[PDB]
Design a protein around this ligand. Sequence first.
Ligand SMILES: Nc1ncnc2c1ncn2[C@@H]1O[C@H](COP(=O)(O)OP(=O)(O)O)[C@@H](O)[C@H]1O
Length: 623
Amino acid sequence: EIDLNDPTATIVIHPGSNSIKIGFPKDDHPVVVPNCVAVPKKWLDLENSEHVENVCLQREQSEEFNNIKSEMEKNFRERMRYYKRKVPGNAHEQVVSFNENSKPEIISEKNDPSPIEWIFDDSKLYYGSDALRCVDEKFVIRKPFRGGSFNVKSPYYKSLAELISDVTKLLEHALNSETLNVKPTKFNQYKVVLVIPDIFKKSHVETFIRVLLTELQFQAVAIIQESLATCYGAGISTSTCVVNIGAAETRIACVDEGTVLEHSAITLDYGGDDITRLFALFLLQSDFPLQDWKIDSKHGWLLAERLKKNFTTFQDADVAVQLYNFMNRSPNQPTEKYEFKLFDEVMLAPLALFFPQIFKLIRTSSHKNSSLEFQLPESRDLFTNELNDWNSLSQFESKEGNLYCDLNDDLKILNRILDAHNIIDQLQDKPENYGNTLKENFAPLEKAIVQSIANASITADVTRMNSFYSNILIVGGSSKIPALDFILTDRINIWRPSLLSSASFPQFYKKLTKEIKDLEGHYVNAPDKTEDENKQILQAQIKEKIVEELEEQHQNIEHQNGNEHIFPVSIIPPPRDMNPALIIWKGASVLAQIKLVEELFITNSDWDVHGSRILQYKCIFTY
Ligand SMILES: Nc1ncnc2c1ncn2[C@@H]1O[C@H](COP(=O)(O)OP(=O)(O)O)[C@@H](O)[C@H]1O
């Protein structure tokens, strides 16, 4: 019952597309609960909405895709050369696929599971790991969450009601488990710290808080953004830049002195799933023993995910023509073992993180539910009536393909950088249906980080650029690819422009901003011409000059009569044998355990009196 602030009575929850992490803050680990709900096929209208898409794929692809994969193969040839080895390659034996029926002795292939005890009873819904053994000739699988936000676009819900009912039944499931054994009636004994994305939907967060308090009936809820948690999870003191690669999205933000820098936040619309898709496509393309591979099927997906989870690498020293194998488990058959060979497919796949247009090509365009999305309108200011979610400059820029990393000359980069505060201004109160609603962000990871970094400095405290370039956390379940930190460093260094490489840029940019201020400022009398309307351009052309004057000055200043100071690229993975997927929960559970949380719990009464308004007063970030 009673509402003290004590870590015993707290539950930490970090939702996401793949799985919901959940447990008490003192737990060495959280329970990781798959983000699924399996629904009997007969309980749903399945005609008009249609797309019985759980049964179809494509080995042959477009020209544009073959081009890109060709380009990807050359990139691979080159790296390989630049260190190691090449061969006769693709020439094969899987063209003659030989299958070996196993007895019911399936020893473990990886992680925590072994042979599959399936579920045929289609008279109830099933949750989590249980939904995963739900044979999909009787069940459909829907997923309440899309990475910390609510999965609005799914076709298998018809209203927020449905969506929330199984959000609450998924959590209850989670909360009822061997290791944390919590029934709904005892829920009101517990506070929750909830992790939320860096660019959250205010309507979603608010809804979620409203449910945790008012339906599930928890004591009090505190919220934190992913990036900040991932810092408490590790070391929070510095200014750091978090890259977070999960299944659906990859998320990048910089954090400095306790706040997530808004204009650094990027959400790339690709992640581990896309790799899993690309990789299976790639094997199919190298004549893989299973040729009709129903991938958007629950059963085939689970295979594509297992292989890639086993086999993808960025480790050039381990790339060889080699002998792998897998067991294709049986909805209604005998377990069948196959044996296949592999060469480059293990790297081409993850390399698509740098050629993400390929990912767009191999998946269908979003098909969101307007009858659902209607019910969850985007939060607006109760006064002005304007979209009032956090709105990132970097996200806007990257989505639109306006990356400094794609700019050649030092002037245009500097002119845009000198322009930012205007573009962020035009952003916050534009005729702003502008800056695409529907568009997905497919910027390549390396160029994205650079943006995130560049904008986080110039829009806050420029001097921290060094700190940022030498604390890039790579976190998140999909980041467990080996040698990711290696290839990534290689690439930023290829791609980060020289102007944004000079360790003395900030000090320079800090000078240029001053001498530009000394033109609007220490000339507060109408410019030298007696009569003017355009004469702000004679000081706009003097701006343009002082730009080039210092821009040049700094380049002559750059020979330095010798050695050069230049930002590092320190990408830091967690140690081998720690789970990057779980840093975030860990961080949230660190918060849950200190003096701070106390000031940050929105209690029930809090909520009833004020509504979403308290987030203005009780919140670790400026709501
Ligand atoms: N060993 C591995 N190699 C590559 N990717 C992996 C490995 N293990 C897990 N993954 C992927 O990590 C991701 C973890 O997702 P999660 O961390 O929840 O992201 P989100 O925040 O969108 O849920 C999944 O896409 C999973 O496929």
